[PDB]
Structure formats: C-alpha cells, structure tokens
Design a binder for this molecule. Structure first.
Ligand code: OUL
Ligand code: OUL
Lengths: 197, 194
C-alpha cells in the first residue's frame, strides 16, 4: 500500500477527505476546473481500497511487462449516480453495470479525458440534494485503437491472431476524449469529487 | 509459480501436454472418469498462464482474508466450444462472452458429466470435445436466480458485502456461477470424444 495513505489499522477500506491548499487536493481541483470551472467542489476524497489497489497494481505490472516501454496509465474521469458510489468505492468499475453510451465504442466502462464530459447530468446524475459525483481514476489504457459499438472486449491487434488484444479502445486515436475498458481491475477509483452547480 | 509447472524457458504462457500414467495425469483423469468413464480422453494439457495465475492468486489471498478461515476454492469443470479455447487459455473466463438462469456469470459444473453435454463442450468438426478443469473461488455462496449481474448481498443492510458466487442448490450444489474476472483459473484442458 502507498506510504502516504492514512493508516487504516487493519481496515481494508477508507475514504480520506482532502484539505484545500494541500498539493494533493489542488492538483485534482485544477484538473477538474480546467473544463468544469462553472461547477463548485464540495469535497475531494482519496479512496484507499487495499484489495482494488492490489489487483490493479498486478494488472499494471503485467501490462508494463507486456508492452514496450509504454505509458500504460492515464488519469481519467468517471461521472456516476449516487446510487453507484458505494459499489464503486468498494468494488470498482463493473462493465456488467454500464449503460449503453450515447456514442458507443463498445460495451465496457467509459472514462473521460475531460471532466466536462463526465460532468454531464447523464453521467454524474445530480442526487436529491443536487450533489454530483465524479471519480478520478487511474486507468490502464495501454495500447489502444478506435472502438466499435458491440465490442465486448478490445479488438485484436491482428486479425490472424484473435487472442492478442489491444488494452482499451477510444473514440479517436489522434485526439482521444474517452477510453473504454473491458476488464475488472483495469481501473482504480483514486479520488471521489463531490460537486454542485 | 507452482512447483509442478514445468520450466517455461522465460515464456509467460504455455500449454504442456501431460504424460499419461504419471501422478498428475492420473489425478486429473480420475476426476473426469468419476462421471465420464464412457468417454475417450485424447490428451490432458496443463495450462501455465503466469499472468492469469498471478491475478487469481491475488483474489484467492483476498478471499481467504475477507472470509477468515474458509475453504474458498473448489475444482470444477467447464465445457466449451473449440473456438473459445484459445481465448480461455490466454485470458481465462469472461462473463461478457447458453442459458444464464442462475445469473449472467461464468458457469462451472461439479460433475464432468454436466460439462460433457454437447450444448457446452460442443463437438468440433472432428468430433473432439473440450472441457477445462478449473480452480474456482466459490467462497461463501447462495442460491442464484435469473438476471443477477453480481452475487446477492449477504444482508441487504450492507448491500456491498456480497456472496462470492451463486449455485443452483446450497445444500447439494451441482453448478456454480462467478461474476468477476480472475475468480477462476483454467488449470487443465481435457480433449476427449464420446
Ligand atoms: N461516465 C463517464 O464519466 C463517461 C465518460 C466518458 C464517456 O464517453 C461517457 C461517460
Ligand atoms: N459450460 C459448462 O460446463 C456449464 C454450463 C452450465 C452449467 O450449469 C447449468 C446446468 C443446467 C442448467 C439448466 N437450467 O438446466 C443451468 C445451468 C454448468 C457448467
């Protein structure tokens, strides 16, 4: 477990409320406000989930081995409804719970480059108190290609070797704005931003 | 990486054909012939997939912690078509890829004879059928039902603390369904005929 996490004393899960003015809070706030400056942040919590981290880091090490000196990890956003927050906090991102996207590049979990995308009410649905929720997520995008509706895994790199797959897919490889991942533990929910109009 | 695996020559995936009449082949054959003695075994292969094993073992260590003094693993069978074999060997089981009456997960049989049905181990254009012997983290389980995308919660007061798998009958299970990647490791592939 990372050394700057708070001591969980044998607990395996904790949400840690960050302080404004700390670099950790400010970097996330800046990343969000880059495209969402009309919204206001209520709080930013660091998600410390030991099991999700372990499984994710194993996948990352594997992808770092398999890929040739790639930057396999991107820090992306994911807007979701209040009802999904307890599940994501404990269990991460489950493709089986994902709705069809308005522009589908495949049946998987969607992550945005820009917070403005995840800030749409269709993703970060405002709760009964008007709070919207967006995760900041370490995502193993790896080597990617343009996706296609109806993918249930990323496509093969080579049609003559159907089992050797891209790591994720995107809407546009030149200018990616979303990534879709198709496997468990390919995304670690790192921060939860609660925010309002 | 398990002692009985044989040397991989720095590869991370290989399928190793077992030698008939030695301990390991005998053990796996016996599990199969317990209910499928009328079939003909052509070969048994050990699946040495380092990445899948790693991810599985992590999940097992986590399950052993979460459940605290439980026997969380069962050895089960999974019949599939020949066209799915390269995928399973390399990537394991994927719920996103038959009936799903106990939930939308991957199905494993207690008895080889259930996986031996042509509807599961579809005979290929040569008559060959394929069945895996699978280490499955069944953990604590409950009865399944149609439409589940994860197992039920153990108590709907804590909706995120879930059963590990579901079954058709908790008292005398004949199948188990798991809903997460890396909860099952395909350990052997049996190629056989009717
Ligand atoms: N849920 C999300 O935040 C989301 C991100 C990128 C998308 O494209 C669609 C949805
Ligand atoms: N692929 C397999 O080996 C396998 C498939 C279905 C399994 O479970 C079921 C067996 C029968 C029924 C049924 N409703 O008759 C449902 C599931 C177990 C294993």
């Amino acid at each position: 477990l990372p050394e700057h996490w708070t001591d969980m004393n044998h607990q395996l899960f904790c949400m840690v409320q960050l302080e404004p003015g700390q670099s950790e809070y400010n970097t996330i706030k800046d990343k969000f406000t880059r495209t969402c400056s009309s919204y206001a942040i209520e709080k930013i919590e660091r998600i410390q989930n030991a099991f999700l981290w372990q499984s994710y880091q194993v996948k990352k090490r594997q992808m770092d081995i398999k890929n040739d000196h790639k930057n396999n990890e991107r820090l992306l956003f994911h807007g979701t409804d209040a009802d999904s927050v307890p599940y994501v906090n404990q269990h991460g991102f489950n493709r089986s719970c994902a709705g069809k996207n308005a522009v589908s590049y495949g049946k998987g979990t969607y992550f945005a480059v820009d917070a403005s995308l995840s800030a749409k009410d269709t993703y970060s649905k405002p709760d009964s108190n008007g709070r919207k929720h967006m995760y900041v997520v370490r995502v193993l995008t790896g080597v990617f290609t343009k996706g296609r509706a109806g993918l249930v895994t990323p496509p093969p790199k080579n049609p003559h070797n159907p089992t050797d797959l891209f790591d994720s897919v995107t809407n546009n490889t030149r200018s990616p704005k979303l990534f879709v991942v198709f496997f468990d533990n390919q995304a670690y929910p790192e921060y939860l931003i609660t925010f309002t109009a």
